[PDB]
Amino acid sequence: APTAPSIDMYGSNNLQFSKIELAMETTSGYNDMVKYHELAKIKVKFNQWSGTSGDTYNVYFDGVKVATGAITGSQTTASFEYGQGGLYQMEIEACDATGCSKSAPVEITIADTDGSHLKPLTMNVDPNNKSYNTDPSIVMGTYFVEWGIYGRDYTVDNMPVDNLTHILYGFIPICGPNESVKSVGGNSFNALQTACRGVNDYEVVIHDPWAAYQKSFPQAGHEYSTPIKGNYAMLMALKQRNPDLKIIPSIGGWTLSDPFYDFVDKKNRDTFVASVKKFLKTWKFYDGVDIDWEFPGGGGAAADKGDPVNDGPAYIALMRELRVMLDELEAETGRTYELTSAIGVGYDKIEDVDYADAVQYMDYIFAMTYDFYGGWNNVPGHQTALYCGSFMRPGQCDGGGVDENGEPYKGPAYTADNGIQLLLAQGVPANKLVLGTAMYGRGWEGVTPDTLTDPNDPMTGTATGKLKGSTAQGVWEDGVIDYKGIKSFMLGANNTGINGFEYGYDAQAEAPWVWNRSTGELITFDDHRSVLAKGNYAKSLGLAGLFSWEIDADNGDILNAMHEGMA
Numbered sequence: 066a067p068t069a070p071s072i073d074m075y076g077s078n079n080l081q082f083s084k085i086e087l088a089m090e091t092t093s094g095y096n097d098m099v100k101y102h103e104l105a106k107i108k109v110k111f112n113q114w115s116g117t118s119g120d121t122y123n124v125y126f127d128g129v130k131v132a133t134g135a136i137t138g139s140q141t142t143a144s145f146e147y148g149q150g151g152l153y154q155m156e157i158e159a160c161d162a163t164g165c166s167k168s169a170p171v172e173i174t175i176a177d178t179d180g181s182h183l184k185p186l187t188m189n190v191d192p193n194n195k196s197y198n199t200d201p202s203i204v205m206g207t208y209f210v211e212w213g214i215y216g217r218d219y220t221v222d223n224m225p226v227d228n229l230t231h232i233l234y235g236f237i238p239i240c241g242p243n244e245s246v247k248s249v250g251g252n253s254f255n256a257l258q259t260a261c262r263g264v265n266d267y268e269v270v271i272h273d274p275w276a277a278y279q280k281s282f283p284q285a286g287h288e289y290s291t292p293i294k295g296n297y298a299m300l301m302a303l304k305q306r307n308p309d310l311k312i313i314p315s316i317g318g319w320t321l322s323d324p325f326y327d328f329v330d331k332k333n334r335d336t337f338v339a340s341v342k343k344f345l346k347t348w349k350f351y352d353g354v355d356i357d358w359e360f361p362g363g364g365g366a367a368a369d370k371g372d373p374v375n376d377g378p379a380y381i382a383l384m385r386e387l388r389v390m391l392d393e394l395e396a397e398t399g400r401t402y403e404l405t406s407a408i409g410v411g412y413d414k415i416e417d418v419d420y421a422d423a424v425q426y427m428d429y430i431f432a433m434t435y436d437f438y439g440g441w442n443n444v445p446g447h448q449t450a451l452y453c454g455s456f457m458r459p460g461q462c463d464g465g466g467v468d469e470n471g472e473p474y475k476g477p478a479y480t481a482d483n484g485i486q487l488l489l490a491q492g493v494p495a496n497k498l499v500l501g502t503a504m505y506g507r508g509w510e511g512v513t514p515d516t517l518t519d520p521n522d523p524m525t526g527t528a529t530g531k532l533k534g535s536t537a538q539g540v541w542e543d544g545v546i547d548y549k550g551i552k553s554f555m556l557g558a559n560n561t562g563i564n565g566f567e568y569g570y571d572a573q574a575e576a577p578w579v580w581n582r583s584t585g586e587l588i589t590f591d592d593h594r595s596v597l598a599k600g601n602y603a604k605s606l607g608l609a610g611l612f613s614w615e616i617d618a619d620n621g622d623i624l625n626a627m628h629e630g631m632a
């Protein structure tokens with residue numbers, strides 16, 4: 066018989082609560098911006114302007130009483146703590162001696178980072194991505210990059226999630242020496258320096274909090290009071306849609322690997338592994354960790370780093386220590402966590418680590434079978450070929466020959482099969498190796514016909530510099546072009562070449578190219594045919610599956626081909 070309470074939406078923060086507290090309007094150090102709590106604090110204001118208010122209130126979630134307290138006149142605040150994320154129908158009841166009266170139910174959101182409060186994400190996928198019935202044992206992975214939401218305009222709801230088993234989210238940085246990030250730009254370095262304020266060196270952080278959790282995506286229903294936004298709330302909603310999908314944070318990559326070279330000291334590995342455990346406890350939708358150190362022994366972005374004696378053993382120790390930590394998380398949560406790594410596949414990278422030893426701790430190695438040639442120099446070659454191409458000289462495939470200046474090759478040529486064969490020769494099990502496909506080309510200009518030593522093969526020519534182009538054509542950085550740009554502006558609908566380009570295919574290498582003889586523009590890439598060849602090779606050798614880099618650059622053709630090739 067008191068008056069039933071009426072809920073004051075606005076003084077109750079629109080009924081948006083959360084276990085994780087996230088700064089939304091400011092940017093500072095990671096430990097200042099992100100605070101995970103075991104209990105969310107819930108504060109709901111209600112009023113009883115007519116009749117009598119009663120003495121006590123009870124708050125119910127789905128019919129279960131979760132809080133109680135005293136009615137305070139015509140407006141009352143119920144404050145309490147709650148440990149379980151979800152969406153609940155809340156009623157508030159007011160009671161006295163003459164009876165109790167309940168409010169109408171209202172939905173309350175209690176966010177947690179497994180997405181338990183979120184409906185399955187609504188997808189917006191290009192319908193060129195087709196449907197397949199691939200064996201669910203086969204890895205079909207891709208990388209999604211955090212910055213793809215800026216000029217590339219490629220968001221989580223654009224991914225063809227039903228054709229993926231693993232999404233690798235690139236990239237999570239490690240606080241410490243990171244001068245290589247300046248090659249991306251000063252704002253990107255500054256973002257990392259801001260994130261690491263108040264954070265110990267060797268701990269992980271989020272590089273761009275705006276893209277990870279602050280930015281409102283209207284396609285995901287985000288609003289002002291949504292407690293978790295950004296890419297991460299979308300990946301939480303994607304996991305609600307596809308609960309068997311593995312989403313794994315990738316630490317490192319080309320510009321973010323400089324801290325790994327300090328892991329020869331165990332104290333820094335210990336700091337790092339602890340920080341990864343804290344990161345996975347904070348962002349519960351992640352299913353493991355991918356380590357992308359480029360590269361133990363050196364040969365990455367920082368020319369002055371790399372210890373070929375001590376980096377391999379440090380890498381193996383890091384994989385052992387990560388697996389010990391992840392087994393602790395499995396015991397605490399009842400979940401399974403995976404440990405993986407993307408690795409270089411030149412002979413010079415593979416010789417610097419004993420992968421037979423490291424891989425006993427790992428679920429998968431993502432073999433980076435791409436970037437063998439590129440616009441960093443003027444030497445054309447197939448960047449992601451399976452086998453040795455027609456352009457290679459006598460003795461170059463195996464490495465016992467000499468170059469066109471008479472200088473001895475130092476090891477086997479850069480092809481995907483030379484790298485796979487060296488990993489298998491070490492003792493790495495085939496069923497843990499995942500072979501890489503490129504969803505982009507690399508390219509040059511100035512490869513004119515008079516530079517070719519073999520006039521049917523422009524990979525025997527010589528370039529004058531990097532491919533240039535607009536972002537409209539998929540050229541975000543000189544020398545690199547998205548596959549979907551190559552298909553729209555170089556291949557055309559018949560795949561034979563448009564806009565002055567002709568398509569070619571090295572049937573021995575398994576490698577496509579497009580060449581404009583007028584501008585000497587040449588691009589090396591992966592296409593439907595080379596990807597089918599990679600699938601056949603993975604089937605033949607019993608590999609774990611395929612992965613691609615990076616998903617925003619595909620128009621569906623490459624992922625469709627990965628499925629067709631593994632069928």
Ligand SMILES: CC(=O)CCCCn1c(=O)c2c(ncn2C)n(C)c1=O
Pocket residue numbers: 212236249253272318319320321
């Ligand atoms: C790793 C690779 O080959 C792709 C590089 C794309 C350029 N790039 C970044 O690497 C990057 C970045 N922001 C953070 N990171 C680590 N942006 C904006 C970027 O363009």
Ligand SMILES: CC(=O)CCCCn1c(=O)c2c(ncn2C)n(C)c1=O
Pocket residue numbers: 319364409410411412414435436437439441479
């Ligand atoms: C096959 C192998 O071991 C490759 C070694 C790295 C190739 N590579 C790059 O990827 C690269 C690069 N500059 C930018 N990037 C991304 N350079 C000079 C390079 O050699």
